[PDB]
Amino acid sequence: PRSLKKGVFVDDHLLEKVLELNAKGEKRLIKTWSRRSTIVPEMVGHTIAVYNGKQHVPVYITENMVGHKLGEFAPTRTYRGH
Amino acid sequence: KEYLTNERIRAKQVRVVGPDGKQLGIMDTREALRLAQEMDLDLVLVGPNADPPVARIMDYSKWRYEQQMAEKEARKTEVKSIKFRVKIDEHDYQTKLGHIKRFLQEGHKVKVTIMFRGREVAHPELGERILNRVTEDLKDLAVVEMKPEMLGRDMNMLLAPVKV
Amino acid sequence: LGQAEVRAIFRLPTGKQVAGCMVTQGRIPRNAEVRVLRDGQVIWQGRIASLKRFKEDVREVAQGYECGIGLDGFDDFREGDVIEAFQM
RNA sequence: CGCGGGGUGGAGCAGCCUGGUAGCUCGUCGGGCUCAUAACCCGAAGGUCGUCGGUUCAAAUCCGGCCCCCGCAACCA
RNA sequence: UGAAACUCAAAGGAAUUGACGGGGGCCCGCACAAGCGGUGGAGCAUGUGGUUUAAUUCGAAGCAACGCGAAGAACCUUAC
Ligand SMILES: [Mg+2]
């Protein structure tokens, strides 16, 4: 069901940030409001703090989660049990 | 309260249990029917969705009637409330006692309450005097389930028949 | 106004309860308060209901004579230990 | 300890007794009906029959233990 | 035979206009009947109630609120 024509979408907020940190090796906690962005393997390894709408929640990123947008790993709604 | 009767059974081979509790085994339907006819009492399929369909060789209608009778017996058993006053007239009290006795004889429980007002000084005492006296009078028909108990504006007791 | 030692409490499947007690201190009257103690924890606290000795129903039990006493609502029967009675 | 009887959807009761077959009323949940609540009517859920076990083709049911409840059981000074 | 204390700013009658009746009569409407096809049973689609949440924006209340304001909420809209 995955939705894009050609050229998979990453926003130039963290896209150009993480490639700079490819030269500093790794980095520590990149808080972005960008959850729209799909995972490219340039990010693989880093720590992305993604905006819940409230919390910049940390994500330790692996090669497996590549074909996914960032906000999937940021659970915005909480709880279900009553 | 309804089961397949004698000829209403189509299910091939039936568990031929008698009116007593005796097993003949897994006879054919027709054979079982014949047996029933011989013995008079019908073949009542009391468990069709079981390991061999449970055919009970009793008169179905008769059985039903018996059950109905039993149910009726069970029915007739009630709780009957007698409501005493605090400052008691004697004749009335006697009448109430008689009523209670009658109820007991019939088979019914008697809930004996005493209607209180304000004035909670000698009211509970009065209630005790009444209810206990009543119990004493009719101890041979009834035993006490609920002792003289305070409800605030009432004193309740329960007279239940000696043997049910 | 007395310290008593428990000798025989009574288990009746008919009548009631009677506590035979040896006085060590002073006197046990009929309208006195009672504390019942074991070796560690206190068993029961309350009052004296009934008083009736072997001879006659003596009002005060002086010196150290054994006297039965009925203890308001006694829950634990047959051989206690120390009964202490307090009164101002 | 004695003897007798009992123990069942949450509550009060039948069924055991006759070995196969678990009902009834009150409550709980949902609906309807009403303007709305009760009442009413409907459904829906809910018991393994104190339990250990046996029996027997199969036990709430027959038997026993233990657990209990209940009644009676002769001693208070 | 017959009070008062106390208490209320009324208790009342007759009629009148209505409204009302498991009063009456005369009528009517898919109101029932007669008939067809559904909803309630299933899944989902919605809107609400309720409950969660950092917020589940607010309103609409029986018919005449509930596929409604919304005749187009990813952001916008959007008020949270
Ligand atoms: Mg209702």
Swiss-Prot record, chain A:
The keyword Ribonucleoprotein applies. Keywords: Ribonucleoprotein, Ribosomal protein, RNA-binding, rRNA-binding. The keyword Transcription does not apply. It comes from the Bacteria. Disulfide bonds: none annotated. SUPFAM superfamilies: Ribosomal protein S19. GO terms for molecular function: rRNA binding; structural constituent of ribosome. Coiled coil: none annotated. Signal peptide: none annotated. GO terms for biological process: ribosomal small subunit assembly; translation. Belongs to the universal ribosomal protein uS19 family. Located at the top of the head of the 30S subunit, extending towards the 50S subunit, which it may contact in the 70S complex. Contacts several RNA helices of the 16S rRNA. NCBIfam families: rpsS_bact (TIGR01050). Part of the 30S ribosomal subunit. Forms a loose dimer with protein S13. This is Small ribosomal subunit protein uS19. It comes from Thermus thermophilus (strain ATCC 27634 / DSM 579 / HB8).
UniProtKB/Swiss-Prot annotation, chain B:
PANTHER family: TRANSLATION INITIATION FACTOR IF-3, TRANSLATION INITIATION FACTOR IF-3, MITOCHONDRIAL. The keyword Protein biosynthesis applies. The lineage of its organism: Bacteria, Thermotogati, Deinococcota, Deinococci, Thermales. One of its GO terms (cellular component) is cytosol. The keyword Cytoplasm applies. It holds the Pfam family IF3_N. InterPro entries: T_IF-3_C_sf (IPR036788), T_IF-3_N_sf (IPR036787), Translation_initiation_fac_3 (IPR001288), Translation_initiation_fac_3_C (IPR019815), Translation_initiation_fac_3_N (IPR019814). GO terms for biological process: ribosome disassembly. Gene3D superfamilies: Translation initiation factor 3 (IF-3), C-terminal domain, Translation initiation factor 3 (IF-3), N-terminal domain. IF-3 binds to the 30S ribosomal subunit and shifts the equilibrium between 70S ribosomes and their 50S and 30S subunits in favor of the free subunits, thus enhancing the availability of 30S subunits on which protein synthesis initiation begins. This is Translation initiation factor IF-3. One of its GO terms (molecular function) is translation initiation factor activity. Belongs to the IF-3 family. Signal peptide: none annotated. Monomer. Binds to proteins S7, S11 and S18 of the small ribosomal subunit. Keywords: Cytoplasm, Initiation factor, Protein biosynthesis. HAMAP family: IF_3 (MF_00080). It is found in: Cytoplasm.
Swiss-Prot record, chain C:
One of the essential components for the initiation of protein synthesis. Protects formylmethionyl-tRNA from spontaneous hydrolysis and promotes its binding to the 30S ribosomal subunits. Also involved in the hydrolysis of GTP during the formation of the 70S ribosomal complex. The gene is infB. Belongs to the TRAFAC class translation factor GTPase superfamily. Classic translation factor GTPase family. IF-2 subfamily. This is Translation initiation factor IF-2. The chain holds residues 479 to 566 of 571 of the full protein. It is found in: Cytoplasm. It comes from Thermus thermophilus (strain ATCC 27634 / DSM 579 / HB8).
